[PDB]
């Protein structure tokens, strides 16, 4: 869309509904007048076009009403209403502006930030925005958490995030424009090339692909018309569902070949009886002409009964040759609809073998997809965010995708190298204890008002805990941990003198022998101004690839470029780095996912802060002391940096309402 | 609604494959037989039926009787009558074999010939003496 409706749907926000959101802030409104509510959108609207046109400066509430039209901007008491609303919750004045009324020369309240990966800045930047003492504590010794890029020389490699995934309404969007960043697209075409090193076929190519997006939509299917959602009390993967599909496939074959063939005997058995009764035909009619030859012998003069009888047998004899002449004809009918069905044998198979390997490869496109084994996906859920999908095509960050944390950290309190290790948080404050990733016993204590969470879920998951909460986090949240999926992915940076390539492809694939090792460096990015090469490993084995040496990798590397390019247009690599994800301690994997028996409700659950117990018993109910965010704790854009900086965006408003109160509801 | 278009997976069909852990290769292993116990027993009446082709080698071109093309009388010669009344004995009311046999009577005069005559041939009797086989 465009206009001001442009804006409702790159902010994300139907252009001509209130949302829940704000019909908590609003519910003068919102219960109110339909006239009203009219005004309001529009206002919203327009402010966010306002915000949007121009987002490399802060948009005030003057600067607002101002472009506001009359009967608008007739009521300021909304347009101020509003346009805080907004402001508040990270829709505008957001990510890196430059500021009119610099930061508010004395703050208020203090907040503890644990990690400054992207959900960490983005909520600290809202924060400190909103004039609070802010401080992150950063276990690394760089900021970006998951979003790592690897410098030197003039090779530039993401080892983290890559592809932002397309702008219609991606908040990214805008830090795109805030930030220098060379937003290059990805050219969907993708060749691949079998275990031999030989493309396949724009034949099989398509008809594979084809058949995978219909087995895909067969699980669906399955899922909800059939309801097949829990098998022997386990919930159902996606992985079972897909073969309990093939399987299927595979017996329909396999029953249409049966009823061919046993079509075939039913006709070729009719063909039996018929040449049985022909057989016992030329039988009589053999001997019958005996007969008459024997009695035409008798010659004449003859007397009646036995010129009757010459005569006689000559009837029944022409008669026994019309039927038999009858049956020739049905015989030579049958005869064909023999070769016909011979002609038209149904498929000798579902998928061949060499098939059923490139199915593979779209497989492990999948287990990327979702950094983990199809085995483990929940079947009704795993897909459940598709609805939220950005419009546009998906893009890579051309000068390594760093350059954004970077930039967002620009302006803050932050401590490189402190390691959270507990958080104690109680009816009057919090307090949060570090340690020195250097020498580790050089300890440290921070005490705050509130504390932000922004520890990965495979932190959050680590048994026995990397990092405690006293009092223990409540059932409920622990349950979410556990119930919830952090799965894995891994990089492989390959950094050379010359382009040996085709230049104008991006991406391409290879198909592993097996089923075991599709995910195996199984597809390929030139993304980079320089010669660098980027290879996934997914699914399976990622995790059992962590466990090899880096030598060893880049072997298996080397190895199969050469088998498609040639085993002497591919040097030696100048330059290799390989990601460890499960392995590196302050990640523990790559991102989250819909495990089977989790559900988008369970995000939900992380995102709830926590509420202390009171100090003196028979005291009232204190504020909440302990927030979340980060990509696991946002439903609708998990495992993403825009999921992230989303959610950064979230607590923040919350954290600040709380705190500094929310004027804007009266 | 329904399945993608040729994909296959009926109700009852999907209980049957996770039944157990490999109730998934039962099935289709009973196929693989369930096949082949035809796709043999189809060389089976091949064979049979190919025995049997042999056998009907030489059509009946050797025993093919020549064309009796001939026309209608109205005159019934005595002769005509005899091999009629004998062709009730042998016949009973076929009145198209009964007309061959005669060779030059339509299938009508045939059966007129059973009113006119039967005064006098007892064709009654004749008739139902056939009857008795
Ligand atoms: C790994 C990965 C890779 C390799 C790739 C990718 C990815 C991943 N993805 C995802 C992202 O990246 C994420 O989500 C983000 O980044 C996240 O953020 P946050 O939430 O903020 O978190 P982080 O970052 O991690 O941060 C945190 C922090 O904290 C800290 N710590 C720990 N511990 C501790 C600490 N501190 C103190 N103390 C203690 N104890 C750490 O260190 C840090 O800093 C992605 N995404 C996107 O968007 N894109 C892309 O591309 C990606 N990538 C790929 O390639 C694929 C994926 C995807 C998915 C889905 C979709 Br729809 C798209 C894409």
């Not at chain 1, 009359?70 to 008491?77: E, G, L, R």
């Not at chain 1, 030579?332 to 498929?347: M, R």
């Not at chain 1, 483990?376 to 965010?385: A, E, F, G, V």
């Not at chain 1, 990509?631 to 979230?650: D, F, M, W």
């Amino acid at each position: 869309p465009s206009g001001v409706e442009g804006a409702a749907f790159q902010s994300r926000l139907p252009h001509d509904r209130m949302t829940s959101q704000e019909a908590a802030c609003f519910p003068d409104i919102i219960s109110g007048p339909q006239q009203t509510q009219k005004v309001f959108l529009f206002i919203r609207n327009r402010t966010l076009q306002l915000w949007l046109d121009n987002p490399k400066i802060q948009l005030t509430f003057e600067a607002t009403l101002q472009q506001l039209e009359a009967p608008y901007n007739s009521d300021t008491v909304l347009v101020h209403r509003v346009h805080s609303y907004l402001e508040r919750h990270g829709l505008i004045n957001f990510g890196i502006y430059k500021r009119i009324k610099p930061l508010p020369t004395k703050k208020t309240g203090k907040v503890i930030i644990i990690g400054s990966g992207v959900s960490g800045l983005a909520a600290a930047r809202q924060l400190q925005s909103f004039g609070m003492d802010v401080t992150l504590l950063e276990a690394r010794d760089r900021v970006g958490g998951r979003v790592a890029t690897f410098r030197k020389g003039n090779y530039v490699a993401d080892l983290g995030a890559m592809v932002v995934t397309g702008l219609g309404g991606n908040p990214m969007a805008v830090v795109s424009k805030q930030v220098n960043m060379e937003l290059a697209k990805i050219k969907q075409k993708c060749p691949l090339y079998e275990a031999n090193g030989q493309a396949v076929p724009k034949e099989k190519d398509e008809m594979v692909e084809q058949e995978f997006n219909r087995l895909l939509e067969a699980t669906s299917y399955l899922s909800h018309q059939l309801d097949f959602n829990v098998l022997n009390n386990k919930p159902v993967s996606l992985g079972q569902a897909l073969e309990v599909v093939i399987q299927l496939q595979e017996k329909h074959v396999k029953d249409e070949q049966i009823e061919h063939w046993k079509k075939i005997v039913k006709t070729q058995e009719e063909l039996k009886e018929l040449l049985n009764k022909m057989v016992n035909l030329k039988e009589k009619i053999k001997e019958l002409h005996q007969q008459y030859k024997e009695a035409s012998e008798v010659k004449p003069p003859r007397d009646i009964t036995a010129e009757f009888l010459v005569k006689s047998k000559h009837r029944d004899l022409t008669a026994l040759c019309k039927e038999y002449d009858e049956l020739a004809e049905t015989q030579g009918k049958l005869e064909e609809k023999l070769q016909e069905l011979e002609a038209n044998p149904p498929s000798d198979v579902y998928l061949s073998s060499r098939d059923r390997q490139i199915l593979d490869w779209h497989f492990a496109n999948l287990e990327f997809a979702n950094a983990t084994p199809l085995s483990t996906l929940s079947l009704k859920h795993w897909d459940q965010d598709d609805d939220f999908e950005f419009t546009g095509s998906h893009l890579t960050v051309r000068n390594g995708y760093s350059c954004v944390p970077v930039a967002l950290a620009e302006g803050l309190d932050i401590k490189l190298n402190t390691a959270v290790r507990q958080v104690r948080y109680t009816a009057s404050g919090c307090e949060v204890i570090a340690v020195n990733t250097r020498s580790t016993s050089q300890t440290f204590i921070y005490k705050c008002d509130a504390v932000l969470c922004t520890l990965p879920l495979g932190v959050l998951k680590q048994q026995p805990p990397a990092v405690q909460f006293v009092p223990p986090l409540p059932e409920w949240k622990t349950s979410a941990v556990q119930r919830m999926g952090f799965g894995n992915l891994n990089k492989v940076v390959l950094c050379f003198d010359r382009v040996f390539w085709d230049p104008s492809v991006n991406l391409f694939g290879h198909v592993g022998s097996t089923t075991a090792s599709r995910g195996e460096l199984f597809l390929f990015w030139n993304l980079y101004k320089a010669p660098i090469l980027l290879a996934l490993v997914a699914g399976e084995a990622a995790g059992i690839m962590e466990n090899i040496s880096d030598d060893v990798i880049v072997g298996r590397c080397l190895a199969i470029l050469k088998g498609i390019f040639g085993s002497s247009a591919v040097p030696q690599p100048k330059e290799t780095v390989v990601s460890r994800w499960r392995a590196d301690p302050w990640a523990r994997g790559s991102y989250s996912y819909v495990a089977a028996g989790s559900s988008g409700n369970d995000y939900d659950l992380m995102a709830q802060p926590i509420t202390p117990g009171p100090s003196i018993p028979g005291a009232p109910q204190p504020i909440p002391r302990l927030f979340f965010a980060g990509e696991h704790t946002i439903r609708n854009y998990p495992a993403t940096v825009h999921g992230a900086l989303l959610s950064g965006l979230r607590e923040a408003g919350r954290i600040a309402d709380q705190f500094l109160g929310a004027m804007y509801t009266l | 609604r329904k399945p993608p278009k040729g994909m296959f997976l009926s109700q009852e069909d999907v209980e049957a494959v996770s039944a157990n852990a490999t109730a998934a290769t039962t099935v289709l292993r009973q196929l693989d037989m369930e096949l082949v116990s035809v796709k043999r027993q189809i060389q089976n009446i091949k064979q049979t039926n190919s025995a049997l082709k042999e056998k009907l080698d030489g059509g009946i071109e050797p025993y093919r009787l020549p064309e009796v093309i001939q026309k209608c009388n109205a005159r019934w010669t005595t002769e005509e009558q005899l091999l009629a009344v004998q062709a009730i004995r042998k016949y009973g009311r076929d009145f198209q074999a009964i007309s061959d046999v005669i060779g030059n009577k339509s299938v009508v005069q045939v059966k007129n010939f059973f009113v006119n005559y039967r005064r006098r041939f007892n064709i009654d009797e004749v008739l139902q003496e056939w009857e008795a086989e």
